[PDB]
Design a protein around this ligand. Structure first.
Ligand SMILES: OC[C@H]1O[C@H](O[C@H]2[C@H](O)[C@@H](O)[C@@H](O)O[C@@H]2CO)[C@H](O)[C@@H](O)[C@@H]1O
Ligand SMILES: OC[C@H]1O[C@H](O[C@H]2[C@H](O)[C@@H](O)[C@@H](O)O[C@@H]2CO)[C@H](O)[C@@H](O)[C@@H]1O
Ligand SMILES: OC[C@H]1O[C@H](O[C@H]2[C@H](O)[C@@H](O)[C@@H](O)O[C@@H]2CO)[C@H](O)[C@@H](O)[C@@H]1O
Ligand SMILES: C[As](C)(=O)[O-]
Ligand SMILES: C[As](C)(=O)[O-]
Ligand SMILES: [Zn+2]
Ligand SMILES: [Zn+2]
Lengths: 592, 592
């Protein structure tokens, strides 16, 4: 767990955890800090749950796709690599680890799927997918199956989908569109139908996973497979004459597999961020340590120019990099998460006889762009009476008096305050519903800033028929004259502002959180201390009164000082029920 | 709540409420302030219940015995009469209305019980109690009663108890001893035994109350009665030729009834202190006002020298004054309440035969200095939001392992920290209770101070076999090196100290508080903020840590400043469950 003077690292079990542990033991021999490497099941999903509470790993190794979402939730800490060390790595890798113009993780290596074929059972690999069935038949009469790969994860099935036009959040103008998804394109459907046909035609088993595929190829039972560099080690120990080459073409077009950038991020809650930076910049990302890691399980094209200079000489590395070039780099935006959850489901339903290709891809098309859901860990990270610097919070519920139906969704911090983002979405999409007489209800943790107050006021004056109500859980810089006037302005302009309470939190839990089936309505009872304190301060703001409480923090959640100063002014003008509700003052005497 | 610009007065229905109302009407005609007089049932007990909430009357008329307790609860306000006016009343009256060197009420008049006899049915009243049965027999042959008086209230039966040495509290120069009680004295036993004999011997009925007694005397059914001046009016309208004289002598000794000083106290919460002072000093305590009150229901000898000087000429007033002289001044200490509540029961149990005279007097003797059933209003005056320095909970429950019986009761401040009071009481009564095993459980308000800690440790060392557990609700001067080291000292000496929580308060409510009959097991749900805060500070104390929170008060319960300073030391050593329970910090920091 995150201990002082200790490093806890999490890396996928398929990679070189022992090699990384050896590098860590060298770090321990030099500085005296135990480096413990762990590989839990589906760490990409366990990491936020434990990092939010605080008991997690000091460093996390994984692709760059989920690092975006992590940094969005404020789980990763910014890395400061001087220009000398920054110039040591290729610019593509750094561009892959940059979120909102800020570096969030150290690039370790590049990984792309490649076609590994048994040179003994097949001297010349096939150049196209259409000839795979015939080949399979010819080898089935001999007692062996060909081209067996993991069908459980969409990362392996995506090359066929993208071969003829599979766009995942089309990119243009330097920005990735979330609404425009391509998993339902003609080419995507064609590729998935071909794979489903390969399964139906008895050429491939839908139950095949990474373990079964790798074991069958290592035992000479299969002539081909699709995998990255990590498998090369076990394949070498299998003494099977194999060859790594490019992936076959689908309908005369090159298969486009996503390019993953294995990177290491530093936990924002770990107090050993200095030790983490030292370990990753001085011992891991060097020819010595990176070579030791590569020794256990190969990691493909590395990010270090010093090592890559003589590592690209391996034809296997060259084939993987060629496949990556033919492919496209994986985006690191947060929505990617949902994207995969959708494709992974579609692929499964396409492998089984539950849904057709069109049905699965259409459901994935409509679910890849989802913002109607929110996880419980991130709910505790944003909607909580306790402070977290990364505001990034908005639960909006729009109701139209005409149809009397609630349309709910969320919003996060995208290089701009969420208020400005919702305003832009409302102004851009004119087809709301009848487009008039709408009641908007916001559930955000931090109070709108002065600039956001002016923007929301201009937006509300722009559209007359908008009944807007705001529920805030925390107060952003409640001791800034401008923020004060902004909140008073919003209230005076017809915007109700109230501090979230038990009712509001439970309502948000039921309507927005992706709570598990069993724990239905089991919302996390938050302490009323800060709820009542922020309510008292907010009422002092509305009454143009001086600040009563003063907070003094120093880190993401470190509270050093807290003071409550109630002047004669407060006792004389602030209503008594609020003071009595905070529980810190006496009732009968507050009234006298 | 208490109204502005209005005077509300509460006086017992047996006094001249109409006369007081007319004086208030004159005050209204002169200053334009409606003075409304009310007479609620059992106001001596209703007044504190409403005064704790703050609502109630502006002025209260009653004996000074209950004013001491009222003042200790912070319910009465200090009066500031000038010397010119103070010299208008008798000095000993002010002495009776003085509590802790401060005048808490305006003395109105003095009242003492007198023997009222029907001059037609009895020409010569009896001079001794021993001849009362004889007289009775004669009148029984006539179809009349000899002596019928209210025996439900101990105020009427006390003269016989004190006739041969019955004292409520011990009398010393400036020192009124609470522990030394004389309700178990030989003379007290003899007096109550004579009363019980009068009841058992068919000379008096044990169910006789004030109503039946007064009505029977006014209807010529009985030849004698015992009453004060207030009954004189109704007796005058009864057309019965009566006479007021001194009380008979028991065993050749004069009957000693407590003398009540009817006084008017000003509610400490009422915002009309000035109006109350004016009404009491300029219109009520004058010859005109006192005469207008005397016309309705006589008040006996008033405290005003101008009126009393020419009022003593009435033989009835002279007889009342003689009974008062031969009697004794009623103490105004708070414990008086319990005292009476004790005697009241004893007497009843002796009249109904449910308990013998010795049993009733012994129980009254043991429960006259304390009270085993605390009222809810005074229990509300004891809690953590109230910073009031005066009241000290001192709820103690002692079990004797030899019998597995629990002894429950309370105690108060009385010019000495409750610690030394309990030490002295236990050291004095050690011989009367069981032999060796003992486990004391304290539920007190303020954490023992430096001096109290040293006294407690020396008491615990003086008695080897004593297991003491302390549950405190607040922390007194938690920023004093001496108090700090004292608490640590008590802990190191084998004494457990913990901050009271919901469970402890519920236990105190169910076992010590006089729970309401209709509302059973409903303990007052109080906010936990200060409970958790004082708990965090207590842990900082025990762990020899620097002060964490700092309070800054300005009035009775006016909290002007409250600061929480959690240094790195605190975060590093304080247990995380306490910090997390306060609700002001994040679990991430607590976990680390
Ligand atoms: O949750 C499944 C996961 O699939 C992909 O993860 C890849 C990973 O990027 C590679 O480094 C390698 O380890 O194979 C994994 C599939 O087993 C996606 O990268 C990821 O977004 C997704 O969550
Ligand atoms: O959520 C992002 C987070 O970044 C920073 O968090 C780190 C930071 O690296 C440190 O300088 C220090 O301030 O606290 C954290 C690690 O101890 C910031 O705290 C803040 O911008 C933000 O919350
Ligand atoms: O403690 C019991 C109760 O007894 C006496 O009360 C008398 C009072 O003195 C009389 O003036 C009359 O008006 O009311 C009571 C008789 O029922 C004590 O004087 C009183 O203080 C005390 O509370
Ligand atoms: C989401 As904000 C920092 O504008 O309140
Ligand atoms: C601190 As104390 C008045 O209970 O001795
Ligand atoms: Zn903003
Ligand atoms: Zn003390």
């Amino acid at each position: 767990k995150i201990e002082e003077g200790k490093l806890v690292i999490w890396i996928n079990g398929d990679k070189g955890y022992n090699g990384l542990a050896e590098v860590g033991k060298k770090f321990e021999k030099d500085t005296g800090i135990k480096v413990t490497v762990e590989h839990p099941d589906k760490l990409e999903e366990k990491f936020p749950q434990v990092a939010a509470t605080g008991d997690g790993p000091d460093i996390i190794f994984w692709a760059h796709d989920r690092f975006g979402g992590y940094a969005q939730s404020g789980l990763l800490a910014e890395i400061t690599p001087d220009k000398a060390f920054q110039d040591k790595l290729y610019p593509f890798t750094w561009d892959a680890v940059r979120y909102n113009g800020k570096l969030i993780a150290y690039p370790i290596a590049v990984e792309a799927l490649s076609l590994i074929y048994n040179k003994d059972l097949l001297p010349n690999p096939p150049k196209t997918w259409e000839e795979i069935p015939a080949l399979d038949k010819e080898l089935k009469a001999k007692g062996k199956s060909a081209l067996m790969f993991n069908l459980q994860e969409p990362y392996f099935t995506w090359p066929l989908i993208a071969a003829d036009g599979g766009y995942a959040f089309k990119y243009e103008n330097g920005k990735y569109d979330i609404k425009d998804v391509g998993v339902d394109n003609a080419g995507a459907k064609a590729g998935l139908t071909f794979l489903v046909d390969l399964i139906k035609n008895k050429h491939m088993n839908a139950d095949t996973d990474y373990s079964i595929a790798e074991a069958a190829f290592n035992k000479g039972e299969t002539a081909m497979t699709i995998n990255g560099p990590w498998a090369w080690s076990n394949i070498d120990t299998s003494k099977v004459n194999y060859g790594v080459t490019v992936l076959p073409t689908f309908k005369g077009q090159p298969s486009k597999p996503f390019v993953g950038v294995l990177s290491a991020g530093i936990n924002a809650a770990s107090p050993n961020k200095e030790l983490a930076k030292e370990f990753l910049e001085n011992y891991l990302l060097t020819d010595e340590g990176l070579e030791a890691v590569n020794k256990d399980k190969p990691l493909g094209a590395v990010a270090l120019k010093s090592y890559e200079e003589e590592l690209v000489k391996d034809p296997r590395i060259a084939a993987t990099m060629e496949n990556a070039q033919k492919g496209e780099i994986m985006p690191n935006i947060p929505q990617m998460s949902a994207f995969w959850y959708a494709v992974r489901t579609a692929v499964i339903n396409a492998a089984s006889g539950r849904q057709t290709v069109d049905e699965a891809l259409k459901d994935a098309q409509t679910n890849s762009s989802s913002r109607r859901r929110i996880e419980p860990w991130e709910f505790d990270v944003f909607y909580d009476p306790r402070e977290l610097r990364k505001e990034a919070c908005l639960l909006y519920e729009i109701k139209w008096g005409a149809s009397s139906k609630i349309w709910r969704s969320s919003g996060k911090n995208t290089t701009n305050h969420v208020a400005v983002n919702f305003i832009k979405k409302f102004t851009s999409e004119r087809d709301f519903h009848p487009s008039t007489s709408c009641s908007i209800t916001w559930f955000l943790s931090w109070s709108p800033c002065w600039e956001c107050s002016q923007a929301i006021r201009e937006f509300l004056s722009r559209h007359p028929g908008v009944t807007l109500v705001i529920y805030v859980a925390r107060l952003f810089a409640h001791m800034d004259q401008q923020n004060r006037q902004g909140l008073r302005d919003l209230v005076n302009s017809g915007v109700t502002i109230q501090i979230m309470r038990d009712s509001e939190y439970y309502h948000c839990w039921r309507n927005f959180v992706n709570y598990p089936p069993g724990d239905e309505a089991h919302w996390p009872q938050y302490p009323p201390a800060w709820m009542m304190l922020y309510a008292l301060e907010l009422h002092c703001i509305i009454l143009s009164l001086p600040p009563c409480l003063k907070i003094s923090r120093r880190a993401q959640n470190h509270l050093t000082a807290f003071r409550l100063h109630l002047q004669n002014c407060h006792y004389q003008t602030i209503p008594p029920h609020i003071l009595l509700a905070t529980g810190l003052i006496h009732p009968s005497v507050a009234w006298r």
